[PDB]
Design a protein around this ligand. Structure first.
Ligand SMILES: [Cl-]
Ligand SMILES: [Cl-]
Ligand SMILES: [Zn+2]
Ligand SMILES: [Zn+2]
Ligand SMILES: [Zn+2]
Length: 221
């Protein structure tokens, strides 16, 4: 049925992975995550949308002779957490925020093995910096900053420039999203690449674009 995992280089040691699902009401949808390398170690930012494709990603990483260090999921939705169970099973360390894990638990879902409280966190010897900007797409959505290459992974908190609206807003914090977007613009003024949870990567404009969309939705509402 659905097309398979894609892996694409977007900067030295930074790979965009793209996986697919059908979603009722939305049709065939793709989802982004990253694989980030430091010193031969690979860190997954968001799992693919399926167990199969999570295994494919891990196999790709091993075939490139990288050491797999772990994964972080940037909110609870299945497009970013589908592979947590499989990874757990392989004793690959999975991370999420404590809040994200509570949502997963409340919904009867597999939790990440490690979690963190607080609005910031760092992984892989500080090569990844994690930040909670406040609610937007969801109450728990996180972003991940790669300071060395000034790449911001926005996840579904950040919309692609081709999007006229906010996407799936059934669990959004529409009224909080503008200030959260503003927080992210203030924190990452020099971001060079911004990676949305869905769609095409771009530059810092994705942050401005998402703030406008959030403001528009909040005002309309
Ligand atoms: Cl969408
Ligand atoms: Cl900066
Ligand atoms: Zn989501
Ligand atoms: Zn999403
Ligand atoms: Zn715009």
């Amino acid at each position: 049925e659905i097309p398979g995992l894609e892996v694409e280089e977007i900067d030295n040691g930074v790979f965009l992975h793209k996986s697919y699902s059908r979603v009722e009401g939305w049709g065939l949808v793709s989802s982004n995550g990253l694989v980030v390398i430091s010193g031969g170690k690979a860190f997954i930012i968001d799992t693919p949308w399926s167990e199969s494709d999570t295994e494919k990603l891990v196999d790709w990483i091993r075939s490139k002779k990288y050491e797999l260090a772990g994964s972080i999921s940037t909110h609870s939705h299945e497009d970013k957490t589908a592979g947590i169970k499989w990874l757990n099973g392989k004793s690959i360390t999975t991370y999420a925020s404590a809040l994200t894990n509570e949502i997963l638990k409340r919904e009867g879902k597999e939790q990440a093995r490690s979690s963190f409280k607080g609005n910031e966190f760092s992984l892989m010897d500080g090569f990844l910096e994690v930040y909670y900007p406040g609610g937007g797409h969801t109450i728990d959505n996180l972003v991940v900053w790669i300071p060395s290459s000034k790449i911001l992974y926005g996840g579904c908190f950040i919309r692609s420039l081709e999007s006229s609206g906010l996407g799936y807003t059934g669990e959004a914090k529409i009224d909080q999203w503008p200030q959260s977007a503003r927080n992210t613009i203030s924190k990452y003024p020099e971001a060079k690449i911004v990676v949305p949870g869905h769609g095409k990567i771009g530059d810092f404009e994705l942050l401005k674009h998402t703030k406008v969309l959030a403001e528009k939705a909040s005002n309309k509402a």
